[PDB]
Amino acid sequence: KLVRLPGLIDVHVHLREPGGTHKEDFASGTAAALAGGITMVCAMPNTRPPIIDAPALALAQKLAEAGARCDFALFLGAASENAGTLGTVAGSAAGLKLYLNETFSELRLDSVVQWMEHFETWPSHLPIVAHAEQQTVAAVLMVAQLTQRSVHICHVARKEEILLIKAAKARGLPVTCEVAPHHLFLSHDDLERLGPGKGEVRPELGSRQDVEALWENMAVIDCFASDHAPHTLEEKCGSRPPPGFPGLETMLPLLLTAVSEGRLSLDDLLQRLHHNPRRIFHLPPQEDTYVEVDLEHEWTIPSHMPFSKAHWTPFEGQKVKGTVRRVVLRGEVAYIDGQVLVPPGYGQDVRKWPQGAVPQLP
Amino acid sequence: KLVRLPGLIDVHVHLREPGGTHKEDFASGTAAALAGGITMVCAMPNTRPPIIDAPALALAQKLAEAGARCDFALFLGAASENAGTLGTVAGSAAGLKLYLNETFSELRLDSVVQWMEHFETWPSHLPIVAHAEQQTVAAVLMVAQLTQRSVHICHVARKEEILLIKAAKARGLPVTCEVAPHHLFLSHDDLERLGPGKGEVRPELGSRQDVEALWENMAVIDCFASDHAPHTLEEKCGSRPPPGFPGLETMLPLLLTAVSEGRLSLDDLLQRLHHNPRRIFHLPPQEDTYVEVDLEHEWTIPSHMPFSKAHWTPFEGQKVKGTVRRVVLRGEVAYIDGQVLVPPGYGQDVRKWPQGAVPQLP
Ligand code: NA
Ligand code: NA
Ligand SMILES: [Zn+2]
Ligand SMILES: [Zn+2]
Ligand SMILES: [Zn+2]
Ligand SMILES: [Zn+2]
Ligand SMILES: [Zn+2]
Ligand SMILES: [Zn+2]
Ligand SMILES: [Zn+2]
Ligand SMILES: [Zn+2]
C-alpha cells in the first residue's frame, strides 16, 4: 500500500558545483534529491566562483542544465559589492541569499547598512532569504521592516529564534521560516557520538530544549529544508572541519517516521515540503510529477547514503519508518528502489518556464 | 569673559561603588563630574553587588546619598532572573539598562526572548537604555517595535550604527542615542600610542571613517554621555585589561575645543548635554545651578586628571581650549579652579524630588 505524494521541494541545498565537485556535483546532489523524494531544489550561491554576479550565474545555469537530474532554481548571493547591480538577472534566480553570520570573504557583509542596501535595491517582489542566527534574526527583521518588505529565515535552530519569529507573526509582520531535519532529530546529546568534526554545523546542534521548542512551535514553521551541505568524511574529520551535514537522502524518511509516530500529520509535512515552498518562492508546479512512499518499511540509517558524495551521515544508526519507492518527474520514471533512471541534464531551470516567473507589477 | 552654561547632565557613568571603590567611588567620581562641569549623573548598575534587585538598589541609594557631591539617578540593570520583579522600584531608578553584548554573569542575557520579557514587563513610561553594538542595535530596535515602545542606544561608536539609527528616525521610530567623547576624538590612529591595554574599550575605538561619520551625522546624536568607566592604570596594563576609559573630567573641555573650532555650536552642545538628557530621561531641573567656563584658555591634557581614581587618561597630550572655572549647585559653590567645595553627601537622588518622578497615566 503506497502513498502518493506530490513532487517535494527543498528550498535550501548546497550542490557544490562549480568548484567543490569532490563534495557533490549537480548530478550527484540531484540523484540524492530524487532518492529522498525531492523533485525540485533551490541551490545556494556559496560555490567557487560564488554566484554573486551575472557571469557566475550564467556559468552555474549551464552547469546545472547539463548536470541536474531534477528541476532547480539557483539563488544569487549578496556581496559587499553587488547591491544595485543584479536587477537584470534578479528574476532569473530563486531569490537573493544573505549570509549574515560567518561566510567566505565574498559573501561576507560587514555592516547592517549593506543589508539595508540589498533590501532597498533587490526587486521588492522577489524572495530574500537569510542565514541569520540568534539576535541576527531580530536584526534582519528590523531591516525588512525599515524597507517595508518580507524576509524568509533559513534553518531556524533554537527556541530563542522560533519564539522571536512567533512574536513577529503575531504582530502581522511578513516573515516566513524553514527548519532543517538535524535541528528536529539531533541535539547536543548526539555530539559525543558524532565527535567534534562531524558535529560541526551552522547553525549548531541545539539543546534538547531547543529541539522540543521547534516541535512545540510547528505551527510557526513554514517549510522544511535540508541545508544539504556535503563535505567528505576526510574534510569533516581533518584539521579544520567545515560546517555542514548532507541531508537530501535522509530528510523525508526522518519526517515520515515522525508522521508515523503522530508527531505531525501528513498534511503538516506536505504544507512544509510542497505547498509553502511553492507559495513563498513562487515556484511553479511540475506536471505529471509525484513520489510513491512505503510508510511501513522499517530500516536503520547506514554509515553513508547511496548517492551524496559526502559519503557519511550524522543520522547513522537512527531507526526510521518510511521509504521512497518511486519518483516520477514530468512523466518519466526518475527513481525506483535505489536506482536513478533519469540522466544528468534531465532537470530544468524552473525560472525559465513561463509559469515559473515571479509575478510583478509593470 | 566667562560663559554661563546650565547644569550639565551625564546620563552614562560608572562610579564603581559598591564593590570597586579602588577604581572610583561616589565621592571621587562626582568630584570628577563637577570638575567637568557636570552637575547631575546617571550611574550604571554593573557594580558589586550589581543593581539588579530592590535590596541592591536600596544599598546603592544610601551609598550615593552619603558619598555623592553632585545630584544623581541610579539605573537598574536587567538580568536573566529579574524581568517582572522590578515594578515596585522601577520609578525610583534612572531607567533600566540592558547589557546586550559582553557583560558579567549577572547582567548577561542569553536570548532575545529575555530582552522581549524586559520590554514587556518594565513600565512602558520609564526609560530603557541599551549597550547594543553593530547588529545588536537593529536587533534591540526590533524588540522595541514588537513591544511598541521607545529605546535609547548607548555610546554609538560606528558609521554603521549612526546610519542605522538615522534610517530608523527617518521612519518615525522612537529611538534616541548618545555618543561618548572617545568615539569623537580618538580612533584607530591612537592605538599605537595607547597600547593594547589602555586602548581596551567597549565599544572599541573606531576608524577615521567611523569618527567622521559621527561628526557628519551630528543631527542624529541626541546626547553626549561620557561612559566614564574608570579602572586603575595597573588594571588597564595588566594581564587581562578591563575595557573602559575615565571621561568625566575631559568630556566638556574636548567638546568646548570643538565648539571653538566651529565643529558644532554652543547650542548643539547644550542640547546634547542638558536639554535632551532632561527630556529623554525626564530628569528635573536643578534650581540655582550653573557652570562658568573660560573659552579662551589653552591647555594640554596631562597624564591623569586631578579627581578620578583611575589616575590615567587616554586623551593625554591632546591640546584643548576651554576650561571649567566655577560650578554652583543648588545655590552653593561646588567647584572653583580645581577645588571641590561641596562635601560627600551634598548630592541628592533626583528621582526622590517631586519634580523628578516620571509622569504616568493612573
Ligand atoms: Na537540462
Ligand atoms: Na545626600
Ligand atoms: Zn545557512
Ligand atoms: Zn534557507
Ligand atoms: Zn546553507
Ligand atoms: Zn496538497
Ligand atoms: Zn556600555
Ligand atoms: Zn548610555
Ligand atoms: Zn557603560
Ligand atoms: Zn537652554
Q: How do the domains of chain A map onto residue ranges?
A: 3-351
Is the distance from CB of B312 to CB of B198 less than 8 angstroms? yes
- Asked: is B3-349 a CATH 3.40.50.720 domain? The reply is no
Which residue in A199, A97, A105 sits closest to A154, CA to CA? Answer: A97
Sheet with B339-340: list strands edge to edge: B3-6, B290-300, B319-329, B332-336, B339-340
Annotated binding-site ranges of A for Zn(2+): 12, 14, 97, 131, 154-155, 178, 227
Is the distance from CB of B119 to CB of B128 less than 8 angstroms? yes
Chain B, window 166-225: residues with a beta carbon less than 8 angstroms from a chain A beta carbon: 167-168, 171
Which residue in B99, B111, B143, B103 sits closest to A207, CA to CA? Answer: B111
Cα(A281)–Cα(A9) distance, rounded to whole angstroms?
A: 11
Maximal C-alpha separation, chain A: 56
Which residue in B81, B23, B71 sits closest to B48, CA to CA? Answer: B23
Strand-strand pairing, B8-13 and B3-6: unpaired
The catalytically annotated residue of B227, B267, B268, B294 is B227
Q: Three-state SS across A28-41? A: HHHHHHHHCCEEEE
What is the stated resolution of the deposited model, in angstroms? 1.2
Consecutive H or E run containing A213? helix A208-216
Residue A183's region, left for phi above 0, alpha for psi from -120 to 50, else beta, is alpha
Q: Enter the DSSP assignment of A292.
A: E
Name the grid cell of B293.
567656563
Name the grid cell of A343.
540522466
Q: Nearest 5°: phi and psi at A130?
A: -135, 140
Q: How far is B143 from chain A (nearest CA, A)?
A: 7
Q: Enter the DSSP assignment of B45.
A: S
Q: Give the CA distances from residue A145 to residues A150, A168, A171, B124, in Å, rounded to whole numbers and listed in that order.
A: 8, 11, 12, 22
**A340 DSSP β-pair partners:** A335
Cα(A310)–Cα(A318) distance, rounded to whole angstroms?
A: 18
Consecutive H or E run containing B60? helix B54-67
Is the distance from CB of A70 to CB of A30 less than 8 angstroms? yes
Q: Give the CA distances from residue B357 to residues B96, B222, B284, B346, in Å, rounded to whole numbers and listed in that order.
A: 15, 22, 8, 20
Query: Which residue of chain B is at minimal alpha-carbon distance from A162?
Result: B113
Which residue in B42, B134, B138 sits closest to B96, CA to CA? Answer: B42
**Does B14 carry a binding-site annotation?**
yes
Torsion angle, CA of A82/A85/A91/A94, rounded to 10 degrees? Answer: -10
Whole-number Å distance, alpha carbon A119 to ligand 7 midpoint, is 30
CA atoms within 13 A on the CB side of A338: 2
Provide the experimental method for this PDB entry. Answer: X-ray
Q: Give the CA distances from residue B298 to residues A203, B44, B324, in Å, rounded to whole numbers and listed in that order.
A: 56, 33, 12
Tell whether A142 lies on the interface with B, counting CB pairs under 8 A: yes
Cα(B200)–Cα(B236) distance, rounded to whole angstroms?
A: 8
The structural architecture, per CATH, of the domain A3-351 is Alpha-Beta Barrel (3.20)
Is the distance from CB of A95 to CB of A119 less than 8 angstroms? no
DSSP symbols for A136-205: HHHHHHHHHHHTT--EEE----SHHHHHHHHHHHHTT--EEEEE-THHHH--GGGHHHHHHHHT--SSPP
Q: Where are the alpha helices (DSSP H) in A266-356?
A: 266-270, 276-281
Strand-strand pairing, B8-13 and B339-340: unpaired
